[PDB]
Design a protein around this ligand. Structure first.
Ligand SMILES: O=C(O)c1ccc(O)c2ncccc12
Ligand SMILES: [Mn+2]
Length: 201
């Protein structure tokens, strides 16, 4: 059992990937990818956008979920059908049939992009899982435990892999190591990851 509460579904989204990527591009045509600035003043190497009713974003030197994209002053694009359906199939298979995300954060990793170790604790109910979908180039996902200094474990996440982070794992510190450059036939030179969240109360 790699991470208590987590359910790894390798290649679960492999068949859906081309459609998912088309929908990423459609979302980004409305709410573009942008590299947000952390509360500490650093520009993230990962570029982000969102779809759904709520979107994860910097605002006033903190993080929060907002119904409005600060870059466009318009709502985030609606949740694509492909996104909704894939998430529900994965969550249901993993034992979370009532998971109803209202936010999907879309991350784009260019070579060298990384995410420092952190917890996702900005959501109102931490009993709801987060569903992660990997597309394109492979990345090393690192995760520890409930404490910042718990022992780290690592696993490669490859194109089409889905992880449902539930139970205890929902609160683990985690991150992504600097992305290795390469080629993928559907994303060309990057990785994307979708993370579905229940962000509304
Ligand atoms: O699955 C991933 O690649 C991933 C990457 C970066 C994150 O901040 C995440 N947060 C929660 C769940 C998954 C992820
Ligand atoms: Mn995270």
């Amino acid at each position: 059992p790699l991470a208590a509460g987590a359910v790894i579904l390798r290649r679960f989204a492999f068949n859906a990937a081309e459609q998912l990527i088309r929908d990423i591009n459609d979302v980004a045509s409305q709410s573009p990818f942008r590299q947000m600035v952390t509360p500490g003043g650093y520009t993230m190497s990962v570029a982000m956008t969102n779809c759904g009713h709520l979107g994860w974003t910097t605002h006033r030197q903190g993080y929060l979920y907002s119904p409005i994209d600060p870059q466009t002053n318009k709502p985030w694009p609606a949740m694509p059908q492909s996104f909704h359906n894939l998430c529900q199939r994965a969550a249901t298979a993993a034992g979370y049939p009532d998971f109803q995300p209202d936010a999907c954060l879309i991350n784009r990793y260019a070579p060298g992009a990384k995410l420092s170790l952190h917890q996702d604790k900005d959501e109102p109910d931490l009993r709801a899982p987060i569903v992660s979908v990997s597309l394109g180039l492979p990345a090393i996902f690192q995760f520890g435990g409930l404490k910042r200094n718990d022992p780290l474990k690592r696993l490669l996440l490859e194109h089409g892999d889905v992880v449902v982070w539930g139970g205890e794992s929902r609160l683990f510190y985690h991150g992504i190591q600097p992305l290795k450059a390469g080629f993928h036939p559907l994303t060309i030179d990057c990785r994307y990851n979708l993370t579905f969240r229940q962000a509304g109360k």
